[PDB]
Ligand binder design. Structure first.
Ligand SMILES: [Mg+2]
Ligand SMILES: [Mg+2]
Length: 408
């Protein structure tokens, strides 16, 4: 109503588009290793999310609907309530999770099918209204064999667990040596974030809460990484935005950057954990590592061009898992936050990014704002980036304000 783009649309409208092929089959009368129990639900949500993004929906709807679908499957089809299992550091059960994972795959359409059979008059889910800041998120594989980046863009808790928490959380995770760590981070950050929010002391700043959620995420990831012998790791850059308090926190491990765009420029908020940074080099040396130039750049023990990461258990202590953080007041002249992987910053500097937003806002109408992140990814590949590329954007001021700002 007073909304723009897909935020104008009803749940039914969005589902019927996403599952148009399945509805058509119905109309034609067609009958259309093992992880731990404590990870099943979040694992399922991430798998559903990836499938929903392939069906062409906006990232925020994909987050919301993935939790809905997983919840519906868990309630209607699963013997075990995986959504109610709490992580316990001394418990790790793998009993029948293989069957469970298959269930969360097979029952996606059945879950949605049953919802679409109902009427909004007696089905509350169909009346959902969309809250929170506007976001944009997407990625491209680029000149790579696998997509090892993951990302999150939650306007607030409505899109995580369909609850009431008002804080937005955005993230990008750039995996190396596999996608297991970045996939895990994407599957479970919402869980550790909401756990921290629920248990927070009054003395915990937003910055502390965000840091704690990443510490807890790495703790859970570490257990599974060791049990399954994962070899790789992931960067993280995460942002929590509290619009009421006019505060934004960032936490990062590695070289995926975060920026704020004001009326005049993009400004980088993160400080890359690369061996060329004298501070990081000292941390590596103190941890017993060495820095060698192998190929064209400085690498820790000749392998990693990063000094901090999620996962990388085999690389500890030379590679640190300690997040760096900051907290920044949000001023009235701050327009958007943008998080990306290094695939973007390899080719674009701050001025390039500003000019890309400027170009998009002059070439496309505001109703297409959700496509801005994909635009930047596509432009990065055109500019010769040779990596996976991912971008998430949070609109601190509404898309209308950004378009007004940029209009020639
Ligand atoms: Mg990578
Ligand atoms: Mg990368």
């Amino acid at each position: 109503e007073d909304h723009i783009g897909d935020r104008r649309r009803s749940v039914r409208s969005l589902l019927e588009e996403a599952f148009a092929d399945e509805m058509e089959k119905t109309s034609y009368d067609v009958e259309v290793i093992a992880g731990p129990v404590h990870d099943v639900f979040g694992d399922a949500i991430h798998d559903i999310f990836q499938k929903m993004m392939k069906r062409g929906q906006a990232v925020d709807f994909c987050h919301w609907v993935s939790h809905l679908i997983a919840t519906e499957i868990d309630e209607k089809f699963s013997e075990v309530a995986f959504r109610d299992v709490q992580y316990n550091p001394d418990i790790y059960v793998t009993d029948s999770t293989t069957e469970a994972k298959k269930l969360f795959n097979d029952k996606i359409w059945p879950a949605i099918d049953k919802i679409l059979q109902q009427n909004a008059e007696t089905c509350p889910i169909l009346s959902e209204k969309w809250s929170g800041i506007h976001v944009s998120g997407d990625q491209l594989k680029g000149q790579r064999h696998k997509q090892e980046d993951r990302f999150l863009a939650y306007p607030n808790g409505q899109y995580m667990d369909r609850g009431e928490d008002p804080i937005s959380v955005l993230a990008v995770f750039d995996g190396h040596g596999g996608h297991e760590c970045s996939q895990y981070a994407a599957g479970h950050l919402w869980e550790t974030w909401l756990e921290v929010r629920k248990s927070r002391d009054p003395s915990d700043s937003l910055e502390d809460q965000l840091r704690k959620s990443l510490e807890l995420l790495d703790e859970r990831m570490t257990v599974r990484s060791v049990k399954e012998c994962w070899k790789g790791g992931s960067t993280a850059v995460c942002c929590a935005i509290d619009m009421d308090q006019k505060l934004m926190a960032l936490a990062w491990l590695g070289d995926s950057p975060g920026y704020v765009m004001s009326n005049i420029e993009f400004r980088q908020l993160t400080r890359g954990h690369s061996p060329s940074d004298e501070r990081e080099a000292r941390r590596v040396e103190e941890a017993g590592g060495q820095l060698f130039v192998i190929g064209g750049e400085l690498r820790v023990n000749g392998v990693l061009n990063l000094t901090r990461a999620l996962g990388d258990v085999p690389g500890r202590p030379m590679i640190s898992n300690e997040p760096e953080t900051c907290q920044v007041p949000i001023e009235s002249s701050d327009y958007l936050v943008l998080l990306a992987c290094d695939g973007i910053s390899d080719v674009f500097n701050e001025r390039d990014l500003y000019q890309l937003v400027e170009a998009f806002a002059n070439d496309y109408p505001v109703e297409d704002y959700a496509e801005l992140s994909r635009f930047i990814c596509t432009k990065a590949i055109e500019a010769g980036s040779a990596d996976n590329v991912s971008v998430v954007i949070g609109f601190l001021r509404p898309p209308q304000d950004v378009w007004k700002l940029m209009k020639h």
